């Protein structure tokens, strides 16, 4: 059986993970949910523990910890280990009964848990793209030290790419390794994008789009931060950098393609020029499930893809004039060093300013550009602990610089 | 280095094979062309010999053997073994210096050369679909005896399917082996079709179509027999039975889909419902090359796929009223026994009659239908030589039965 821990079990990734685990387990007993970890949602955690009966429970916020002890006494034939805070998270990662960990947490806590899962040589199903973009150098170093640890991508485009690779080759290497693309015979990547709500808009219309325009008309219902990133196409920009780090693909060999139907999730061109792609209805359960079953697949009862009903698939080039965030992401990635850390941090501020109606659409890319131009390349620390501190310092500096630029103009 | 024999080196498959070998060898010395076999085309064989310098030359026609011998004296520093007929073909197949054999011949010579390749435990890159459809039981039996022989599909849709599979699983089985689909986690196949030249005709327009119409201004230039089969969609019918035999996929799990752009070459749905597809411009060099490099890939200088330029891909269900040959193929496959042998043989006659303007479009399916209805299932022979004789007997009966029906309504 596959022993799995879910970090952030009441978030979107976590709930989708538990839903597909539930459905697959009805078909055949495949998964043992060993651990659940949430921030502060005691009642939701209790209800999950009542169904999945994990050996470990953990909650971050200590003011709801004692409530969790009293609630789980209601569950018959069940004596779980009930833990708190960052210290519980570490004991879960070191537990020898856990093989795979789904990281469904954003920001620093996602990176911190990822770090501990890798230190304990686990398979890490990673759905936090910002951690790869910001701390890719640190994750690469850590994965070279902890040779049995693996990152398996959950982001849909990256899962699609991963699914297009031959496991006879993949098993000779692992994600984030130097030479991954060479071993897998990868020549080039088509990174598919929905395009967001603004593909048909003129430059003059883009000047005055609001956060309500981005959030009120979604194709896909998702969180506010990623919804804004989808609108500016900075989501895809971040995903270009994620692609480079995960698969060791040069930036000149990564192409963003707008595919509004969201059936083809991305494609891999091999060195012979044959192209392989992965397809399904938009549904995060497939990428999540593959991350937990890889290198095998298991039966599901999901609706089969009806290609004749779909009927038409379309592809076009994104306009870099209309979506300058894409260009900025390529520029940062190509310049290398900590420019991706700077890009991610400045976007975090700009995205939130736009979300709260403080700035306009082209101010987002204007602020990010100015912060990138202000950054001086730094010698990359050889020491793992110094490197993490270097990444955090640069992240903090870039957020501050973005905010000062906003304050000056305001 | 990969040591290759090409059977039918001056036909379409053979010429494409030598073209891609030449171009790949310019990039890196990968292939040794060890043997070339042709029916009659002595001058063309000489030109190929001058370039590729194979250890073996074989010509089927005894009357040009002395001519070939004399021509080859013009080639500097070159002393090939020059052979003739079925005996020369047997000698090439049994050479320890040949690893892989491309079968680019039709009809008896194709089946016979395939048989000898398998008996000598070679990798057999098979482009003759009619051999699988007509003699699938015999090939299965022979591959069970000769455990190290392998059939690798060259037919473009079947190559596409093969390229969509995980080689970590393919290497634990082989084509035409029972349980191939289970081991590879296959649920369902989308078998892509161009639709042929008559795809948008009304029933009234279909009644009148001639072979000249099928052959003129074609989307893809290919041989006359396959062009007529593409027009009736019996090409796809035969390919459904080919899919069943190569991959052990049930007929209810094979769907024919009309994809007029011919970019997606076929798709595989796995048991989790994720779908993987293979794409390129229509070009037989990719499927041929993959058959010779499998389980690896090598570099080419082929034009990269420009998805944005292609722009739109479409998919629709074929009409079984307009293309009754598809229905007849499924019926024959599902009934099993030697019904596929009968279908292939009766189509061979009906195709040729329509090609030569002797019968109309709907007479093709009428003739095939009547021969199929007349056939009575037989006990399948246990001995492999008895089985080969049984298949050849049924093939000959079905051709004669088709011709009789033609002569009765003449
Ligand atoms: C496999 O399931 C889905 C779900 C939803 C969708 C549509 C949203 C795609 C993407 C969100 C994302 O980054 N994802 C899902 O990873 C928004 P974009 O930047 O491409 O404009 C596609 C596929
Ligand atoms: C990979 O290269 C090509 C070349 C040509 C084409 C177009 C012809 C496709 C097919 C011929 C065939 O059976 N083939 C190539 O295997 C004719 P249909 O029955 O689908 O109507 C597509 C792909
Ligand atoms: Mn994504
Ligand atoms: Mn074909």
Swiss-Prot record, chains A, B:
It is an enzyme of class 1 (oxidoreductase). NADP(+) binds at residues 10-13, 39-41, 130, 223. 1-deoxy-D-xylulose 5-phosphate binds at residues 129, 156-157, 194, 217, 230, 235-236, 239. Mn(2+) binds at residues 155, 157, 239. Its EC number is 1.1.1.267. One of its GO terms (biological process) is isopentenyl diphosphate biosynthetic process, methylerythritol 4-phosphate pathway involved in terpenoid biosynthetic process. One of its GO terms (molecular function) is NADPH binding. It comes from the Eukaryota. Inhibited by fosmidomycin and its derivatives. Keywords: Apicoplast, Isoprene biosynthesis, Magnesium, Manganese, Metal-binding, NADP, Oxidoreductase, Plastid, Transit peptide. Its cofactor is Mg(2+); Mn(2+). It catalyses: 2-C-methyl-D-erythritol 4-phosphate + NADP(+) = 1-deoxy-D-xylulose 5-phosphate + NADPH + H(+). Binds 1 divalent cation per subunit. Mg(2+) or Mn(2+). Its main location: plastid. Pathway: Isoprenoid biosynthesis; isopentenyl diphosphate biosynthesis via DXP pathway; isopentenyl diphosphate from 1-deoxy-D-xylulose 5-phosphate: step 1/6. Belongs to the DXR family. Homodimer. Catalyzes the NADPH-dependent rearrangement and reduction of 1-deoxy-D-xylulose-5-phosphate (DXP) to 2-C-methyl-D-erythritol 4-phosphate (MEP). This is 1-deoxy-D-xylulose 5-phosphate reductoisomerase, apicoplastic. It comes from Plasmodium falciparum (isolate 3D7). The chain holds residues 77 to 486 of 488 of the full protein.
């Amino acid at each position: 059986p596959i022993n799995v821990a879910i970090f952030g079990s009441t978030g979107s990734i976590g709930t989708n993970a538990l839903n597909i685990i539930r459905e697959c387990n009805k078909i055949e007993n495949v998964f043992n949910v060993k651990a659940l970890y949430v921030n502060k949602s005691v009642n939701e955690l209790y209800e999950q523990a009542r169904e999945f009966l994990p050996e470990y429970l953990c909650i971050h916020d200590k003011s709801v910890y004692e409530e969790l002890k009293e609630l789980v006494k209601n569950i018959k034939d069940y004596k779980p280990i009930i833990l708190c805070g960052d210290e519980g998270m570490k004991e879960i990662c070191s537990s020898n009964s856990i093989d795979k960990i789904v990281i469904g947490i954003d920001s620093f806590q996602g990176l911190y848990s990822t770090m501990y899962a890798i230190m304990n040589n686990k398979i890490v199903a990673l759905a936090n793209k910002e951690s790869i973009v910001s701390a890719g150098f640190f994750l690469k170093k850590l994965l070279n030290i902890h040779k049995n640890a693996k990152i398996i991508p959950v982001d849909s485009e990256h899962s699609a790419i991963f699914q297009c690779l031959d496991n006879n080759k993949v098993l000779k290497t692992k994600c984030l390794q130097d030479n991954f693309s060479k071993i897998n015979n990868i020549n080039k990547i088509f990174l598919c994008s929905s395009g967001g709500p603004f593909q048909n808009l003129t430059m003059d219309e883009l000047k005055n789009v609001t956060s309500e325009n981005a959030l009120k008309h979604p194709k896909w219902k998702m969180g506010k931060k990623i919804t804004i990133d989808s609108a500016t196409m900075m989501n895809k920009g971040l995903e270009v950098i994620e692609t480079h780090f995960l698969f060791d693909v040069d930036y000149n060999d990564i192409e963003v393609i707008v595919h509004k139907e969201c059936i083809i999730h991305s494609c891999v061109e091999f060195i012979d020029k044959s192209v392989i792609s992965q397809m399904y209805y938009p549904d995060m359960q497939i990428p999540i499930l593959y991350s937990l079953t890889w290198p095998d697949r298991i039966k599901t009862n999901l609706k089969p893809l009806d290609l004749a009903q779909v009927s038409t698939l379309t592809f076009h080039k994104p306009s870099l004039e209309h979506f300058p965030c894409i260009k900025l992401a390529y520029q940062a990635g190509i310049k290398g060093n900590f420019y991706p850390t700077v890009l991610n941090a400045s976007n975090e501020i700009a995205n939130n300013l736009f979300l709260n109606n403080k700035i306009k659409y082209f101010d987002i890319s204007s602020i990010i550009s100015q912060v990138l131009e202000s950054f001086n390349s730094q010698k990359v620390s050889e020491n793992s602990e110094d490197l993490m501190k270097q990444i955090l310092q640069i992240h903090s500096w870039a957020k501050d610089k973005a905010t000062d630029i906003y304050n000056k103009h305001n």
